[PDB]
Amino acid sequence: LSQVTPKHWEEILQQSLWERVSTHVIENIYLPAAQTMNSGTFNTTVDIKLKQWTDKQLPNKAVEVAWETLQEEFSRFMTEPKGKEHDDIFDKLKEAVKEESIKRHKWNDFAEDSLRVIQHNALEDRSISDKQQWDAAIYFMEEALQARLKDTENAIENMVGPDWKKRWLYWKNRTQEQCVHNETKNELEKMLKCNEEHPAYLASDEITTVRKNLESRGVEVDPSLIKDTWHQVYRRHFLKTALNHCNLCRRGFYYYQRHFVDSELECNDVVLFWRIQRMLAITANTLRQQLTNTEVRRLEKNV
Amino acid sequence: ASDEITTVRKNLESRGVEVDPSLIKDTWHQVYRRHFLKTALNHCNLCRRG
Amino acid sequence: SLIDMYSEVLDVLSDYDASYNTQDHLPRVVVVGDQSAGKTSVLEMIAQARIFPRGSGEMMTRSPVKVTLSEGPHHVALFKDSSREFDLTKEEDLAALRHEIELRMRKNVKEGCTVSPETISLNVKGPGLQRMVLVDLPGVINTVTSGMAPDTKETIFSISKAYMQNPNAIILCIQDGSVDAERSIVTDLVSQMDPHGRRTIFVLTKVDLAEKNVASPSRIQQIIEGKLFPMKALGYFAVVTGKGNSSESIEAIREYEEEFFQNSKLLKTSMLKAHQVTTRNLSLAVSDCFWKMVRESVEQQADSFKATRFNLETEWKNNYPRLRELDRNELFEKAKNEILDEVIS
Amino acid sequence: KEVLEDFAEDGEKKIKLLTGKRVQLAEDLKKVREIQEKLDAFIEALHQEK
């Protein structure tokens, strides 16, 4: 098990850890901070949220992710079928020892405290000296944004359905509720188009206006449904806006190189994602070294 | 109603026009009077053979 | 010593935070008493000096006083706003201090009222004094005095409730031993506001007078052992405030109280525990419990303050990385220099 | 010079004139740091007694 290339361990650890915490990071930190248009307030909120989460929750998640990855490789190797030559009498003993060993497993307690400082200093940097690192952060942001966008599209498609061109090709007819949601979508489209910087939250008088236009179409919709549709529409619109920001920030490295703070192309999100990506690389390497050295002796002792 | 004024004002802002509620009320009064008179004229045509 | 810094921290916290958002995170000592219930005598006994004004049945305490007991080379009292030291070892200075405190009480009174809600922080130093912070409050009057404002009773109740709002505040109820618990509203309020009793402490005054009144031993034992009172507190203590005279010396009262309890038949009969009497035992227990709670609370506050300051510094860097923070005075100096430069230009 | 001296002696006018994010941040940071310094001295002195 220790005769595996370190690259394979790092790739698995990085992907597992990133997917484990991507939902929490984006939803609970990025989204609340992105609402404000003030870059200084946005950055301050991100830093406060990062410190609160990292000091208490980050080491626990990293330990669980690293232990789970070790469990996957170890348990699989215990039960890898070596073709027709695989023996079956030893499998029962292997499984019994595996379960007992897992129960007796105990990760180092001092690793959590040490790693807390390690990633704290790693994330404290705010300078990207490499052009390729900036490009890598853009690509990493695009992949993460596309995954979230696809989930948002799936929810929107479920509530509405396929396009009239597409539904004609597939011979599918929208339900009465689906058509109601489609009409609400058009109303929200016009509202967002007129006010390109509308706040995320809603107001009662806005619901009244929307409801009246629906009654003009002979459609009655409860305020709760309008709020739910608005939330999904705003999320989709914000993700598309971020994608446009990524395209503008693609050639913004040269501007950032001269510290063009006065320039409106303040790619704060790209810098923040680059810090996360750099932190993940350090964390993956550190966990790989700890797995290869620290916990091997404990595994042997328990066996 | 006040919420009706809000709706109308928002659509005006979508056109980049700011209008006070008082002006909207005055215009609505004249428009309603003209609409009601036209409605009565249509009623007269229907009531011609009534 | 240590309590001097703790008292200073509380004062600055009150000035910085007008609301009790942060002030309700540190332990405090709250004292509530009735009229002629010996509340002043008990506070004077703990301070080992009669510094509050005395009156023939009149509520001289017209304004709350934050009396702080600390460690000092001599037993002296110092005002927070005034540097004029008063030596409590001399009776002449004690009388002058009482007049000064009464004058401060009248000065702080606003228009249309008789008792002001403002609290005056007083630092009473002395060698061997217990390191704790006490709060003096006007006595609760069953009947509103004609010479006082109609809202004086409401103001006293509001001040007591505001002080008791701190979940870590220690309640110190003071009443009279010659009056039954059903005839006083303060004891009912204390029990209602502390259903758990994790911090309630009850102090009974005029125990010698109650004993001379042939009080029933069952009622006294139930009060001390917490049987008659539905609330279950940490403990109960009884102290003697003398014969009730407003001119008796503290030393004579303390010596008489010790002799009275030593020769008391109730203690020698083991009806009441020997460690549940005298002011020394009560002061030591309160000081140790209060200090331990302070130690835990101050550690949490220090970490929170450091984190809060870090957030403010981070915001400053994000918004103004190339600027320097200056106070109101320094900004005025910088502004005038720029004006002079523009004059020359 | 005369105007500045009169303004300097009246802090209330300064408070009314000095209203801004930078001013409030500096004042709050000074107060918080002052409280924190007192807390550190209190904690260290308390723990050094034993």
UniProtKB/Swiss-Prot annotation, chain C:
User: Which residues are recorded as binding GTP?
Assistant: S36, G38, K39, T40, S41, G55, K206, D208, T241, G244, N245
> So which domain of life are we looking at?
Eukaryota
Q: What is the effect of changing M60A?
A: Decreased GTPase activity
Q: What is the effect of changing D303A?
A: In interface mutant 9; strongly decreased ability to mediate mitochondrial fusion
What result is annotated for mutating D136A? Strongly decreased GTPase activity
Outcome recorded upon mutating R295A: In interface mutant 9; strongly decreased ability to mediate mitochondrial fusion
Q: What is the effect of changing C289Y?
A: In OPA1 and DOA+
Effect recorded for E225K: In OPA1 and BEHRS
Effect of altering E182A? In interface mutant 5; strongly decreased ability to mediate mitochondrial fusion
Q: Where does Mg(2+) bind?
A: T40, T61, D136
Result when mutating T40N: Abolished GTPase activity without affecting the ability to bind membranes
Renumbered to this chain, region (G5 motif) spans 239-242
- Where does this one sit in the cell? Mitochondrion intermembrane space
Q: Give positions of region: G4 motif.
A: 205-208
Which residue intervals make up region (G2 motif)? 59-62
**This chain belongs to which protein, by name?**
Dynamin-like GTPase OPA1, short form
Q: Which organism is it from?
A: Homo sapiens (Human)
Taxonomic classification, please?
Answer: Eukaryota, Metazoa, Chordata, Craniata, Vertebrata
Swiss-Prot record, chain D:
Location of this chain's protein in the cell: Mitochondrion intermembrane space
Q: Which residues form a coiled coil?
A: 1-50
**Stated role:** Constitutes the soluble short form (S-OPA1) generated by cleavage by OMA1, which plays a central role in mitochondrial inner membrane fusion and cristae morphology. The transmembrane long form (L-OPA1) and the S-OPA1 form higher-order helical assemblies that coordinate the fusion of mitochondrial inner membranes. Inner membrane-anchored L-OPA1 molecules initiate membrane remodeling by recruiting soluble S-OPA1 to rapidly polymerize into a flexible cylindrical scaffold encaging the mitochondrial inner membrane.
In its UniProt entry, what is this protein called?
A: Dynamin-like GTPase OPA1, short form
For this protein's source organism, the top of the classification is: Eukaryota, Metazoa, Chordata, Craniata, Vertebrata
Q: Which gene is the coding source of this polypeptide chain? A: OPA1
- The shown range, given as first to last of full length, is 911 to 960 of 960
